[PDB]
Amino acid sequence: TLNGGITDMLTELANFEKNVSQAIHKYNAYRKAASVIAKYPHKIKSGAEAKKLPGVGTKIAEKIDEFLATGKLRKLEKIRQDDTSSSINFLTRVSGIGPSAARKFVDEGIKTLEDLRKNEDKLNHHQRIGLKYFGDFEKRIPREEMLQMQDIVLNEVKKVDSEYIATVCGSFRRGAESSGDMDVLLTHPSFTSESTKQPKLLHQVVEQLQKVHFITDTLSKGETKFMGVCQLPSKNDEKEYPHRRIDIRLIPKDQYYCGVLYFTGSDIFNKNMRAHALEKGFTINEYTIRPLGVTGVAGEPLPVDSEKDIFDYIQWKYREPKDRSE
DNA sequence: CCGACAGCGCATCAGC
DNA sequence: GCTGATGCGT
DNA sequence: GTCGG
Ligand SMILES: O=c1ccn([C@H]2C[C@H](O)[C@@H](COP(=O)(O)NP(=O)(O)OP(=O)(O)O)O2)c(=O)[nH]1
Ligand SMILES: [Cl-]
Ligand SMILES: [Cl-]
Ligand SMILES: [Cl-]
Ligand SMILES: [Cl-]
Ligand SMILES: [Cl-]
Ligand SMILES: [Mg+2]
Ligand SMILES: [Mg+2]
Ligand code: NA
Ligand code: NA
């Protein structure tokens, strides 16, 4: 992290614009800049040098100069002082609580971990489980623990139906030595863009994992997406492992590649690729890549047999998962 | 200038 | 009950 | 907040 100082400042500023200002476009702007600077292979020496990178303009260039001279940013110094901003920002750290509920809670006088705890009757299901595991969800997952969780998920999935295919994506598939959570892509031959021959496909898996005490709680659950909690089992006399966030996405088997491409990310890489796709005249989502007609309407699905085919369509050299961490 | 900024599943609400 | 708009995480 | 046309 050659420019750790600047990317943090930019990230903080982005968190502030989304959580407090509820100005999402500014949030993304800062996030892009932090991303492009994060990969810049030199230790930035000036705002001007930074403004050369795409995504960094006059304002951010200005901020980088203020940051390099003093080692800080006045705009953030003040923001840290403002009690309201500090509270809203803190509450958004509880999973399920976003910018609106955060400001709403503060309006009601609920602004500290302690406040939330005594007002559990004022949170929806997700916010409650999010508070329950506030601490745990802040901790990273060592890859080694990820490999162990993978064994359970894949082996438990095989026991349900040998035809299920569970692939761990997210930062794990990109090769990170630590993940914020485990992301699992699930496919089965009975569920395709053509037909759903078997109901309760995701449920069956969720059920099997709950039976073995892997899945402990559920944030939200539908027929194709599951957002919950899981925990690696521990040995006798062994301290327990922290509770971990788990996302499971059931995708039509004939749409695996657009699915695995999406779920591997990162989120910004996807954004950059989906933007570039548009400029090339295509639209990409987790299910397919379609062309864009003059009218501006998406056409029918283009055939895909590998992730690379999708890169080829938009004229981008193939990039391995490890190089998509933007 | 100024429109565009990736795309969408699930929970929850309002209006009916 | 439904559909649509919004919040949230994604 | 930044960008392309
Ligand atoms: O806004 C989003 C969030 C996620 N995604 C994709 C890319 C991301 O890698 C994947 C999994 O989502 P996570 O929130 O789990 N992120 P990731 O696994 O990359 O990082 P982390 O280690 O924080 O979980 O879903 C998007 O496309 N858009
Ligand atoms: Cl904005
Ligand atoms: Cl600062
Ligand atoms: Cl596909
Ligand atoms: Cl589609
Ligand atoms: Cl998702
Ligand atoms: Mg993840
Ligand atoms: Mg996830
Ligand atoms: Na620039
Ligand atoms: Na949150």
Check: CB of residue A250 under 8 Å from CB of residue A202: yes
State the maximum Cα–Cα separation within chain A, in Å, rounded to a whole number. 66
A180 carries a ligand binding annotation: yes
Does at least one atom of strand D sit less than 7 Å from the CB of A56?
yes
Resolution in A: 2.3
A80 carries a ligand binding annotation: no
CB < 8 Å & 24+ apart, contacts of A233-239: none
Query: In sequence order, what are the beta bridge partners of A250?
Result: A186
Rounded distance in angstroms from the CA atom of residue A252 to the C1' atom of nucleotide B14: 33
Domains and CATH numbers, chain A: 3-82 (1.10.150.110), 83-139 (1.10.150.20), 140-262 (3.30.460.10), 263-325 (3.30.210.10)
Ligand at minimal distance from the CA of A257 is: 4
Structure tokens at A300: 């029918």
- A95 in ligand 1 pocket by Cβ < 6 Å? no
Does at least one atom of strand B sit less than 7 Å from the CB of A270?
yes
| Beta strand pairing call for A178-179 and A141-142 | antiparallel
DSSP A262: H
CA A48 to ligand 9 centroid distance, Å: 9
Rounded distance in angstroms from the CA atom of residue A33 to the C1' atom of nucleotide B13: 36
Nucleotides of B under 7 A from a protein CB: 4-13
Buried b (16+ CB within 10 A) or exposed e, A47-67: beebbebebbeeebbebbeeb
A185 carries a ligand binding annotation: no
For this PDB entry, the determination method is X-ray
* Closest-lying ligand 1 atom to the alpha carbon of residue A178: 22
Check: CB of residue A254 under 8 Å from CB of residue A314: no
DSSP A290: E
- A170 in ligand 1 pocket by Cβ < 6 Å? yes
Please name which of A61, A70, A2 lies closest in space to residue A30, comparing C-alpha atoms.
Answer: A61
Does at least one atom of strand B sit less than 7 Å from the CB of A266?
no
Overall residue count recorded for chain A in this entry? 326
| Spatial separation of the C-alpha atoms in residues A227 and A257, rounded to whole Å | 22
| Spatial separation of the C-alpha atoms in residues A248 and A37, rounded to whole Å | 32
| Beta strand pairing call for A215-221 and A141-142 | unpaired
CA A55 to ligand 3 centroid distance, Å: 20
**Looking at this protein, which amino acid is placed at residue A326?**
E
Does at least one atom of strand B sit less than 7 Å from the CB of A28?
yes
Backbone angles phi, psi at A108, to 5 degrees: -90, 0
Question: Is A63 an annotated catalytic residue?
Answer: yes
| Spatial separation of the C-alpha atoms in residues A164 and A245, rounded to whole Å | 22
Check: CB of residue A97 under 8 Å from CB of residue A130: yes
| Spatial separation of the C-alpha atoms in residues A301 and A292, rounded to whole Å | 11
Structure tokens at A3: 């420019």
A216, containing H or E segment: strand A215-221
